[PDB]
Amino acid sequence: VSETWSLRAPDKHARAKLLEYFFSKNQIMKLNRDLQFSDLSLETEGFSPLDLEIFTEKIFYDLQLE
Amino acid sequence: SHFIIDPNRTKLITTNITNRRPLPLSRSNLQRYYGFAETFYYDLHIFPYVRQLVNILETSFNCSQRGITLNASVLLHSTTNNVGKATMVRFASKYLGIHLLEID
Numbered sequence: 645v646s647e648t649w650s651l652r653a654p655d656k657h658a659r660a661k662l663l664e665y666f667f668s669k670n671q672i673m674k675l676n677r678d679l680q681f682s683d684l685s686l687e688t689e690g691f692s693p694l695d696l697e698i699f700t701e702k703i704f705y706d707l708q709l710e
Numbered sequence: 711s712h713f714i715i716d717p718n719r720t721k722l723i724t725t726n727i728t729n730r731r732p733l734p735l736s737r738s739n740l741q742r743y744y745g746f747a748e749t750f751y752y753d754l755h756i757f758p759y760v761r762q763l764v765n766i767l768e769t770s771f772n773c774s775q776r777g778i779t780l781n782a783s784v785l786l787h788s789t790t791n792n793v794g795k796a797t798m799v800r801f802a803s804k805y806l807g808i809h810l811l812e813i814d
């Protein structure tokens with residue numbers, strides 16, 4: 645192997661984009677006007693993309709409960 | 711529309727299998743009517759964990775019926791044995807009238 649590449653944990657801006665897209669995938673979701681993806685990413689540091697997947701599905705379920 | 715069956719005059723043929731949802735516990739307590747080992751009936755208001763887990767199955771079932779697919783999985787763990795987690799699984803299954811697939 646000449647050189648290599650490593651996929652470090654996603655960054656806050658990466659998280660903003662990824663959360664937006666993941667919500668989009670289950671387009672059925674919606675969000676309050678005040679809640680903005682950029683604001684959302686600030687408190688989801690050190691999460692793997694699969695972690696964000698499971699978190700968004702859990703959130704979808706949580707909404708379904710109420 | 712109706713009809714009578716007599717073994718000495720009527721023949722019966724088993725055929726392929728057909729799906730059908732099982733009745734929810736609310737409409738009947740099959741164990742109680744047939745006097746089996748009736749599974750303890752929780753009062754969801756007093757078993758919050760059971761309520762939380764149930765709050766998963768019907769939502770998944772509806773979203774599936776509403777055309778929304780989602781792989782809802784859950785794992786039970788505990789610090790001590792003999793807590794009947796399997797019992798609560800069975801209780802939840804009968805509560806929603808859902809088929810159970812138990813594999814020891």
Ligand SMILES: Nc1ncnc2c1ncn2[C@@H]1O[C@H](COP(=O)(O)OP(=O)(O)OP(=O)(O)O)[C@@H](O)[C@H]1O
Pocket residue numbers: 750790791792793794795796797798
């Ligand atoms: N409220 C209750 N909660 C749990 N089990 C109960 C309850 N009331 C009666 N039981 C009985 O207790 C037993 C529970 O056994 P079960 O195998 O489900 O336990 P478990 O928590 O999975 O434990 P383990 O796997 O360590 O044996 C069953 O025989 C069930 O009928």
